Design an enzyme around this catalytic site. Structure first.
Site, short mmCIF file in Angstrom:
data_model
loop_
_atom_site.label_atom_id
_atom_site.label_comp_id
_atom_site.label_asym_id
_atom_site.label_seq_id
_atom_site.Cartn_x
_atom_site.Cartn_y
_atom_site.Cartn_z
N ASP A 99 33.11 16.35 -3.72
CA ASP A 99 34.90 16.51 -4.63
C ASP A 99 35.58 17.50 -5.12
O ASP A 99 34.57 18.72 -4.90
CB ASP A 99 34.87 15.04 -5.66
CG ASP A 99 33.44 15.27 -6.62
OD1 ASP A 99 33.25 16.45 -6.75
OD2 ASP A 99 32.97 14.23 -7.34
N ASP A 276 34.91 6.17 -1.18
CA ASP A 276 33.12 5.98 -1.89
C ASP A 276 33.13 5.70 -3.28
O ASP A 276 33.98 5.21 -3.89
CB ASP A 276 32.57 7.28 -2.72
CG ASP A 276 33.92 7.84 -3.49
OD1 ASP A 276 34.76 9.19 -2.98
OD2 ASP A 276 33.29 8.30 -4.53
N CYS A 314 21.90 -10.71 5.70
CA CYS A 314 22.27 -8.66 5.90
C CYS A 314 20.80 -8.76 6.05
O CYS A 314 19.79 -9.18 6.08
CB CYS A 314 21.61 -8.39 4.01
SG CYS A 314 21.54 -6.94 3.69
N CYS A 316 19.26 -5.56 6.36
CA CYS A 316 18.35 -4.25 5.32
C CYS A 316 17.26 -4.39 5.40
O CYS A 316 16.99 -5.37 5.80
CB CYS A 316 19.45 -3.89 4.14
SG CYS A 316 18.30 -4.88 2.47
N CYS A 319 15.80 -7.16 2.96
CA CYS A 319 16.14 -8.47 3.16
C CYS A 319 15.07 -8.77 4.43
O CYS A 319 15.25 -10.19 4.71
CB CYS A 319 17.75 -8.95 3.05
SG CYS A 319 19.04 -8.50 1.89
N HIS A 345 19.36 -2.34 -0.46
CA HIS A 345 19.98 -3.26 -0.13
C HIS A 345 21.40 -3.23 -0.24
O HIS A 345 22.16 -3.29 0.25
CB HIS A 345 19.36 -4.82 -0.93
CG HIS A 345 20.33 -5.69 -0.65
ND1 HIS A 345 20.93 -6.52 0.33
CD2 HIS A 345 21.44 -5.96 -1.74
CE1 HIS A 345 21.77 -6.91 0.17
NE2 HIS A 345 21.98 -6.89 -0.65
ZN LIG Z 1 19.97 -6.46 2.17
#
Ligand SMILES: [Zn+2]
Ligand SMILES: [Zn+2]
Lengths: 382, 382
Positions: A99, A276, A314, A316, A319, A345
């Site tokens: 930015d 963002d 999820c 990820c 998880c 996560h």
């Molecule tokens: Zn997750």
């Protein structure tokens, strides 16, 4: 020749598929490919509480955001350049968007303000700094960032119709100055990209005036400024409804500082390609996880024996291993690992949201995804 | 005057209650009171993997053990003294017992051996060091420890009747030398205590010879050496059966390097008052927890969804919060917190074992506790 051996362009935005105002595609840059619509996590210093860059990459992020204002206060732009640039500083070798610093001047710092630029006191140590279209672009050059934001003037929310118009016109004069400063440095102009920022508050005629001005100057991408500053989602969506169509269709559209998952979905429905937000990180540090059934506060007693992952779908890394019960234990103990896992996560969940958005646009079922998403997110059957 | 304002003695062993050969009571020293039978955790350097001294204290430990051999190799005894002594070095202001270094010379280091003493090479950097009754007592003085062990000669297991006898006789000559060196330093003799070590391997006549020799010299306490070196529990108990009654009744009896929970219980049944072992720490680092139903290996899949604490009755800080499932998660992730929690629990479990031993002797039900303990520990219904 393989893709790995092939020349990479400075900035190439291709649109692969559309559904209504929504688009999915790619931005090719020298440091990598950005899949759109894109979510950019906000990068920070490498403290004990920050995720490792390889972890951020593994969540799915193609590009991260650097805050020019914070980097120019500590350790400073010249220091970052001597250390090799922001990519070397952060250990992130893919694209970085910076930015301009102008927002934090308003919100965090201010000694002098004029058409020249602004002078301000560090909120840290009182030292004086100056920003202008020219100084902001120079600092972003010292940082070595790949996408450079024009320096504009923010008007705090809510702004008088009078304040809105004078600020937008100054921002457009400052947008030309940003363009010329960027173009003055061969190293920057050949290797990076420059985005302009539309202003005009809620006033359709001001927004059109800004869009026409920015399109006449010419930019690689266009942000919609002046939103996510207190106006509420209804108003935000209403402004997006007429503001995004004003921008050039064949360039990326960036909604700065947005936001909650439902904000992102609705903004993509209105033609936004880039986002963002600090929200996944802030929430993670505060014990809040995003899920397809809405946010949850992991400190709640109901999670102390819950062996399910943070979110049921999820994929990820958190998880695939950790239960709500054990993340609850870590957070309640004040163990930094708990916040790290939540944050990983949350950022990964945001990337999986973007991937579902991209996939659904490609398949022509994004409007239905957005409906399904809202019904479940707001039902909060977590 | 309160207990806090009252003069503390150098070394006062009082026996409060007896059941058969078992005793419970207290050792009063200048740095605090030691409840007996006592378990001494083995202290180490303050690494990222070591428990904090306040955590060790909160598990119930009244005294810890320092390994003279390791401290004399790094950072060295003179350095520890310059830093204020071992209590300051370790952040532990209660009593510390130091061993003599002689065992690790045998087991870890050896250049020269004679009646004079021994010279040996560091297993670390090859440097040469010397130990003798006199040098060992001097080093333990530099460390500032509260209970000092006489320097003796270990014979490796299993030892010829010939080797057993010559080693015991040398150890008894070295026991007199340790006594005289200790007595030569007013600062040490007025403020610390000295234990002698009975040797003689499995031979009742050698053990009696050693006991008589040590009793003639006179010590504040008496250890039974030469056990826990490979002989098995049956043999160990058989030797204890006739060796402990040979030692002075009114002084503490110390079984060095023992051991497993069932070893401790049976040794108390035979008149032992003091114990040390690295086992709770070694097991904790290796994913093994002690419980009243025997040891468990927390990496086992059966624990991945087990919301019960490590042990069903343990009141350590770990068991009042953390489940098997979450300690399993941490260990499987290689997170140092997992090993720290296991280690804290194991040391606390050992202290709770000692407290149950003390309580049951006081109430005259220790023989029944030992029977109940073995039936459950060996049934392994965890
Ligand atoms: Zn997750
Ligand atoms: Zn426990």
């Amino acid at each position: 020749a393989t893709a790995q051996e092939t020349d990479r362009p400075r900035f190439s935005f291709s649109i692969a598929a559309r559904e209504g105002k929504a688009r999915t595609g790619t931005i090719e840059m020298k440091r990598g490919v950005i899949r759109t619509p894109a979510f950019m996590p906000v990068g920070t210093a490498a403290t004990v509480k920050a995720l490792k860059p390889e972890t951020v990459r593994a969540t799915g992020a193609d590009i991260i955001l650097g805050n020019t204002y914070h980097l120019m206060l500590r350790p400073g732009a010249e220091r970052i350049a001597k250390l090799g640039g922001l990519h070397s500083f952060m250990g992130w070798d893919r694209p970085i968007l910076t930015d301009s610093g102008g927002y934090q001047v308003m919100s965090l710092s201010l000694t002098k303000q004029s058409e020249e630029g602004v002078t301000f006191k560090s909120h840290l140590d009182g030292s004086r700094h100056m920003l202008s279209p020219e100084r902001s672009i120079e600092i972003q050059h010292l940082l070595g960032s790949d996408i450079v934001m024009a320096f504009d003037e923010s008007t705090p929310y809510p702004a008088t119709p009078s304040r809105a118009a004078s600020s937008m016109e100054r921002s457009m004069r400052w947008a030309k100055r940003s363009r010329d400063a960027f173009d003055s440095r061969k190293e920057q102009a050949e290797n990076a990209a420059l985005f302009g920022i539309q202003q005009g508050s809620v006033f359709e005629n001001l927004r059109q005036q800004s869009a026409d001005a920015l399109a006449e100057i010419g930019f690689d991408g266009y942000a919609v400024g002046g939103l996510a500053v207190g106006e509420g989602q209804d108003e935000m969506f209403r402004v997006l409804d007429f503001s995004v169509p004003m921008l050039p269709d064949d360039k990326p559209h960036y909604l700065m500082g947005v936001g909650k998952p439902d904000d992102i979905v609705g903004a993509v429905e209105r033609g936004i390609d880039m986002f963002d937000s600090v929200l996944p990180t802030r929430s993670g540090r505060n014990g809040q996880a995003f899920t397809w059934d809405g946010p949850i506060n992991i400190r709640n007693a109901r999670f102390s024996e819950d062996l399910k992952p943070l979110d049921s779908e999820c994929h990820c890394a958190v998880c695939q291993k950790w239960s709500r019960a054990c993340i609850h234990a870590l957070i309640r103990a004040g163990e930094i690992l708990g916040a790290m896992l939540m944050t990983e996560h949350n950022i990964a969940f945001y990337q999986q949201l973007m991937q579902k958005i991209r996939d659904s646009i490609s398949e022509g079922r994004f409007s239905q995804f957005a409906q399904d998403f809202r019904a479940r997110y707001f039902a909060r059957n977590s």
